[PDB]
Amino acid sequence: LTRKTYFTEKEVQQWYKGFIKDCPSGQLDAAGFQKIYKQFFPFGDPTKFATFVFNVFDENKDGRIEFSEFIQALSVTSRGTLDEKLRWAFKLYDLDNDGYITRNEMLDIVDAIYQMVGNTTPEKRVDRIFAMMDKNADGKLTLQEFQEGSK
Ligand SMILES: [Ca+2]
Ligand SMILES: [Ca+2]
Ligand SMILES: [Ca+2]
């Protein structure tokens, strides 16, 4: 009985039917996630990125994606406003969950993105956007620095 999500509730209904359709156990864990990413990027190694994305999906950090976490992710990512979408992206970068994005963290992401695709540089690229987004130049990005930098 969500409705705390951009879905109608003859929409939660399909998404659940689809959920137990894909994953009948009702719990897809890191391993399953990791392999479908292997299918999603068969010209690279999605392992690093697959993990960062899985970590944002699994909000209570138990190592499983329940429906609540799956259906909220979809809502935000597919239908939420730009801020809400950027807030979700922010969590992905913020690996240690301390509320900032640092240079090596963002480098890690760019490195993950670079690794997942890479046969068909991260360093110079991150310096570019961080210098761009980091207005006060403290070496950290706040959500606000990130949201505005992106827009
Ligand atoms: Ca969970
Ligand atoms: Ca951080
Ligand atoms: Ca800053």
CATH class of this structure's domain 1-81:
mainly alpha
CA-closest candidate to residue 100, choices 135, 142, 136:
142
The experimental technique used to determine this model is: X-ray
Resolution (A): 2.6
CA of 25 to the centre of ligand 3 (A): 43
Which residue from 1, 147, 3, 11 is spatially nearest to 81, judged by alpha carbons?
147
- The set of residues, in sequence order, having a beta carbon less than 8 Å from that of 54 and lying 6+ positions away, is 30, 33, 34, 65
User: How far, in Å, is the centroid of ligand 2 from the Cα of 112?
Assistant: 16
| CA–centroid distance, residue 56 to ligand 2 (Å) | 13
Q: Provide CATH code, domain 82-151.
A: 1.10.238.10
Domain segments of the chain as ranges: 1-81, 82-151
Nearest 5°: phi and psi at 56? -75, -30
State the CB neighbour count (10 A cutoff) for residue 35: 12
Domains 1-81 and 82-151 share a fold: yes
Ligand nearest to the CA of 143: 3
* Widest CA span in the chain: 48
Binding positions are 58, 60, 62, 64, 66, 69, 94, 96, 98, 100, 105, 134, 136, 138, 140, 145
Distance between CA 10 and CA 39 in Å, rounded? 31
